Design a protein around this ligand. Structure first.
Ligand code: HEM
Ligand code: HEM
Lengths: 86, 86
Protein backbone atom coordinates (compact mmCIF):
# COMPACT_ATOMS: atom_id res chain seq x y z
CA UNK A 1 0.00 0.00 0.00
CA UNK A 2 1.62 3.28 -1.16
CA UNK A 3 2.14 5.95 1.50
CA UNK A 4 1.08 8.67 -0.95
CA UNK A 5 -2.37 9.46 -2.30
CA UNK A 6 -2.40 10.47 -5.95
CA UNK A 7 -4.98 12.77 -7.56
CA UNK A 8 -5.77 13.22 -11.24
CA UNK A 9 -6.10 16.83 -12.39
CA UNK A 10 -9.67 16.08 -13.41
CA UNK A 11 -10.40 15.55 -9.72
CA UNK A 12 -8.56 18.73 -8.68
CA UNK A 13 -10.42 20.80 -11.28
CA UNK A 14 -13.71 20.05 -9.44
CA UNK A 15 -12.70 21.76 -6.18
CA UNK A 16 -12.81 25.30 -7.54
CA UNK A 17 -14.99 27.28 -5.14
CA UNK A 18 -14.68 28.76 -1.66
CA UNK A 19 -16.57 25.72 -0.31
CA UNK A 20 -13.71 23.37 -1.21
CA UNK A 21 -10.58 24.91 -2.71
CA UNK A 22 -7.79 22.70 -4.00
CA UNK A 23 -4.69 23.94 -5.79
CA UNK A 24 -1.61 22.36 -7.33
CA UNK A 25 1.89 23.73 -6.61
CA UNK A 26 5.01 22.00 -7.94
CA UNK A 27 3.25 18.68 -8.58
CA UNK A 28 1.54 18.46 -5.19
CA UNK A 29 -2.08 18.95 -4.21
CA UNK A 30 -3.15 21.36 -1.46
CA UNK A 31 -6.54 21.94 0.16
CA UNK A 32 -6.32 25.65 0.99
CA UNK A 33 -10.02 26.07 1.80
CA UNK A 34 -9.46 27.25 5.37
CA UNK A 35 -6.49 29.43 4.41
CA UNK A 36 -8.46 31.65 2.02
CA UNK A 37 -9.27 34.21 4.72
CA UNK A 38 -5.72 34.26 6.14
CA UNK A 39 -3.83 34.82 2.92
CA UNK A 40 -1.80 38.06 3.14
CA UNK A 41 -2.37 38.58 -0.57
CA UNK A 42 -6.15 38.35 -0.33
CA UNK A 43 -8.45 35.57 -1.51
CA UNK A 44 -9.60 36.85 -4.91
CA UNK A 45 -6.15 35.98 -6.30
CA UNK A 46 -6.42 32.46 -4.85
CA UNK A 47 -10.00 31.71 -5.93
CA UNK A 48 -9.11 32.75 -9.46
CA UNK A 49 -6.75 29.78 -9.64
CA UNK A 50 -8.59 27.25 -7.52
CA UNK A 51 -8.80 23.83 -9.15
CA UNK A 52 -5.64 24.58 -11.10
CA UNK A 53 -1.84 24.57 -11.18
CA UNK A 54 -0.81 27.92 -9.67
CA UNK A 55 2.93 27.13 -9.57
CA UNK A 56 3.87 29.87 -12.00
CA UNK A 57 2.11 32.63 -10.09
CA UNK A 58 3.33 31.37 -6.70
CA UNK A 59 6.97 31.60 -7.86
CA UNK A 60 6.56 34.72 -10.03
CA UNK A 61 5.30 36.81 -7.13
CA UNK A 62 8.16 35.40 -5.12
CA UNK A 63 7.01 33.68 -1.95
CA UNK A 64 9.17 33.64 1.17
CA UNK A 65 10.58 30.47 2.73
CA UNK A 66 8.08 31.20 5.52
CA UNK A 67 5.21 30.96 3.04
CA UNK A 68 6.62 27.66 1.76
CA UNK A 69 6.78 26.23 5.29
CA UNK A 70 3.11 27.18 5.68
CA UNK A 71 2.09 25.21 2.57
CA UNK A 72 3.13 21.97 4.23
CA UNK A 73 0.02 21.98 6.42
CA UNK A 74 -2.48 22.04 3.55
CA UNK A 75 -0.84 19.20 1.64
CA UNK A 76 -3.26 16.36 0.86
CA UNK A 77 -1.48 14.42 -1.91
CA UNK A 78 0.55 14.29 -5.15
CA UNK A 79 -0.51 14.78 -8.76
CA UNK A 80 -1.04 11.45 -10.53
CA UNK A 81 2.01 10.39 -12.63
CA UNK A 82 -0.21 10.38 -15.73
CA UNK A 83 -0.82 14.12 -15.36
CA UNK A 84 2.78 15.23 -14.76
CA UNK A 85 4.54 17.35 -17.41
CA UNK A 86 7.88 15.63 -18.32
CA UNK B 1 -16.47 35.28 -2.96
CA UNK B 2 -15.43 38.98 -3.29
CA UNK B 3 -14.77 39.98 -6.93
CA UNK B 4 -16.39 36.86 -8.39
CA UNK B 5 -18.58 37.41 -11.49
CA UNK B 6 -21.61 35.09 -11.92
CA UNK B 7 -23.61 34.13 -15.01
CA UNK B 8 -26.79 32.10 -15.45
CA UNK B 9 -26.62 29.23 -17.95
CA UNK B 10 -29.32 31.01 -19.94
CA UNK B 11 -26.92 33.93 -20.45
CA UNK B 12 -24.15 31.54 -21.51
CA UNK B 13 -26.42 29.77 -24.01
CA UNK B 14 -26.82 33.04 -25.92
CA UNK B 15 -23.13 33.05 -26.83
CA UNK B 16 -23.20 30.19 -29.31
CA UNK B 17 -21.88 31.63 -32.57
CA UNK B 18 -18.38 32.47 -33.80
CA UNK B 19 -19.18 36.12 -33.07
CA UNK B 20 -18.97 35.60 -29.31
CA UNK B 21 -18.25 32.08 -28.10
CA UNK B 22 -18.62 31.02 -24.46
CA UNK B 23 -18.28 27.53 -23.06
CA UNK B 24 -18.75 26.05 -19.59
CA UNK B 25 -16.10 23.71 -18.15
CA UNK B 26 -16.25 22.47 -14.55
CA UNK B 27 -18.71 25.18 -13.51
CA UNK B 28 -16.68 28.08 -14.88
CA UNK B 29 -17.38 30.26 -17.91
CA UNK B 30 -14.77 30.80 -20.63
CA UNK B 31 -14.83 33.21 -23.54
CA UNK B 32 -12.95 31.21 -26.20
CA UNK B 33 -13.87 33.50 -29.09
CA UNK B 34 -10.21 34.34 -29.85
CA UNK B 35 -9.03 30.76 -29.31
CA UNK B 36 -11.26 29.23 -32.01
CA UNK B 37 -8.54 29.39 -34.67
CA UNK B 38 -5.68 28.30 -32.39
CA UNK B 39 -7.26 25.08 -31.12
CA UNK B 40 -5.19 22.09 -32.25
CA UNK B 41 -8.36 20.02 -32.41
CA UNK B 42 -10.06 22.40 -34.82
CA UNK B 43 -12.72 25.11 -34.49
CA UNK B 44 -15.66 22.93 -35.49
CA UNK B 45 -15.64 20.76 -32.36
CA UNK B 46 -15.70 23.97 -30.30
CA UNK B 47 -18.57 25.67 -32.16
CA UNK B 48 -20.59 22.46 -31.98
CA UNK B 49 -20.63 22.83 -28.21
CA UNK B 50 -20.63 26.64 -28.00
CA UNK B 51 -22.92 28.04 -25.31
CA UNK B 52 -23.04 24.76 -23.41
CA UNK B 53 -21.23 22.80 -20.71
CA UNK B 54 -18.42 20.94 -22.49
CA UNK B 55 -16.86 19.33 -19.42
CA UNK B 56 -17.47 15.71 -20.47
CA UNK B 57 -15.98 16.13 -23.94
CA UNK B 58 -13.00 18.12 -22.67
CA UNK B 59 -12.17 15.51 -20.06
CA UNK B 60 -12.94 12.49 -22.27
CA UNK B 61 -10.35 13.35 -24.83
CA UNK B 62 -7.84 13.55 -22.09
CA UNK B 63 -6.55 17.09 -22.48
CA UNK B 64 -2.98 17.69 -21.26
CA UNK B 65 -1.85 19.73 -18.25
CA UNK B 66 -0.76 22.36 -20.79
CA UNK B 67 -4.26 22.47 -22.22
CA UNK B 68 -5.66 23.04 -18.69
CA UNK B 69 -3.24 25.92 -18.15
CA UNK B 70 -4.39 27.65 -21.33
CA UNK B 71 -7.92 27.83 -19.89
CA UNK B 72 -6.81 30.44 -17.38
CA UNK B 73 -6.64 33.17 -20.02
CA UNK B 74 -10.26 32.71 -21.10
CA UNK B 75 -11.86 32.61 -17.66
CA UNK B 76 -14.55 35.31 -17.30
CA UNK B 77 -16.71 34.13 -14.40
CA UNK B 78 -18.54 31.35 -12.54
CA UNK B 79 -21.85 29.63 -13.24
CA UNK B 80 -24.54 30.64 -10.76
CA UNK B 81 -24.86 27.97 -7.99
CA UNK B 82 -28.55 27.49 -8.78
CA UNK B 83 -27.69 26.37 -12.31
CA UNK B 84 -25.22 23.72 -11.20
CA UNK B 85 -26.69 20.21 -11.34
CA UNK B 86 -26.35 17.70 -8.45
C1 HEM C 1 0.31 27.92 -2.30
C2 HEM C 1 -0.70 28.66 -1.40
C3 HEM C 1 -0.18 30.00 -0.90
C4 HEM C 1 0.34 30.30 0.32
C5 HEM C 1 0.56 29.36 1.51
C6 HEM C 1 0.68 31.71 0.30
C7 HEM C 1 1.24 32.39 1.34
C8 HEM C 1 1.58 33.72 1.38
C9 HEM C 1 2.20 34.43 2.49
C10 HEM C 1 2.58 33.79 3.83
C11 HEM C 1 2.37 35.70 2.11
C12 HEM C 1 3.01 36.86 2.92
C13 HEM C 1 4.42 37.32 2.38
C14 HEM C 1 5.40 36.22 1.88
O1 HEM C 1 5.72 35.32 2.75
O2 HEM C 1 5.81 36.27 0.72
C15 HEM C 1 1.85 35.83 0.75
C16 HEM C 1 1.81 36.98 0.00
C17 HEM C 1 1.32 37.12 -1.29
N1 HEM C 1 0.79 36.08 -2.03
FE1 HEM C 1 0.58 34.20 -1.48
N2 HEM C 1 0.34 32.26 -0.94
C18 HEM C 1 -0.18 31.22 -1.69
C19 HEM C 1 -0.63 31.36 -3.00
C20 HEM C 1 -0.64 32.53 -3.74
C21 HEM C 1 -1.12 32.63 -5.13
C22 HEM C 1 -1.67 31.43 -5.95
C23 HEM C 1 -0.97 33.93 -5.50
C24 HEM C 1 -1.29 34.63 -6.84
C25 HEM C 1 -2.73 34.51 -7.33
C26 HEM C 1 -0.40 34.63 -4.36
C27 HEM C 1 -0.10 35.97 -4.30
C28 HEM C 1 0.45 36.67 -3.25
C29 HEM C 1 0.76 38.08 -3.24
C30 HEM C 1 0.52 39.03 -4.42
C31 HEM C 1 1.31 38.35 -2.03
C32 HEM C 1 1.83 39.71 -1.53
C33 HEM C 1 0.75 40.77 -1.24
C34 HEM C 1 1.42 42.03 -0.77
O3 HEM C 1 2.05 42.67 -1.65
O4 HEM C 1 1.34 42.35 0.43
N3 HEM C 1 -0.20 33.77 -3.29
N4 HEM C 1 1.39 34.61 0.34
C1 HEM D 1 -12.15 25.67 -24.88
C2 HEM D 1 -11.33 24.75 -23.97
C3 HEM D 1 -10.24 23.93 -24.69
C4 HEM D 1 -8.90 24.13 -24.69
C5 HEM D 1 -8.11 25.22 -23.96
C6 HEM D 1 -8.32 23.07 -25.52
C7 HEM D 1 -6.99 22.91 -25.75
C8 HEM D 1 -6.39 21.94 -26.50
C9 HEM D 1 -4.97 21.75 -26.73
C10 HEM D 1 -3.87 22.65 -26.14
C11 HEM D 1 -4.82 20.68 -27.52
C12 HEM D 1 -3.50 20.06 -28.04
C13 HEM D 1 -3.12 18.78 -27.24
C14 HEM D 1 -3.19 18.88 -25.69
O1 HEM D 1 -2.50 19.82 -25.17
O2 HEM D 1 -3.88 18.07 -25.06
C15 HEM D 1 -6.15 20.17 -27.83
C16 HEM D 1 -6.45 19.08 -28.63
C17 HEM D 1 -7.70 18.58 -28.92
N1 HEM D 1 -8.87 19.10 -28.43
FE1 HEM D 1 -9.07 20.65 -27.23
N2 HEM D 1 -9.33 22.25 -26.02
C18 HEM D 1 -10.51 22.77 -25.52
C19 HEM D 1 -11.75 22.22 -25.79
C20 HEM D 1 -12.01 21.13 -26.58
C21 HEM D 1 -13.37 20.61 -26.83
C22 HEM D 1 -14.66 21.23 -26.23
C23 HEM D 1 -13.23 19.57 -27.66
C24 HEM D 1 -14.34 18.67 -28.26
C25 HEM D 1 -14.47 17.27 -27.65
C26 HEM D 1 -11.80 19.41 -27.92
C27 HEM D 1 -11.21 18.46 -28.71
C28 HEM D 1 -9.88 18.29 -28.96
C29 HEM D 1 -9.31 17.27 -29.81
C30 HEM D 1 -10.12 16.20 -30.58
C31 HEM D 1 -7.96 17.44 -29.78
C32 HEM D 1 -6.93 16.59 -30.52
C33 HEM D 1 -6.38 15.50 -29.56
C34 HEM D 1 -5.36 14.64 -30.23
O3 HEM D 1 -4.49 15.16 -30.95
O4 HEM D 1 -5.48 13.42 -29.99
N3 HEM D 1 -11.07 20.37 -27.25
N4 HEM D 1 -7.08 20.94 -27.19
Amino acid sequence: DPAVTYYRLEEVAKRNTAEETWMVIHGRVYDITRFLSEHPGGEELLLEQAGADATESFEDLGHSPDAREMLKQYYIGDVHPNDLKP
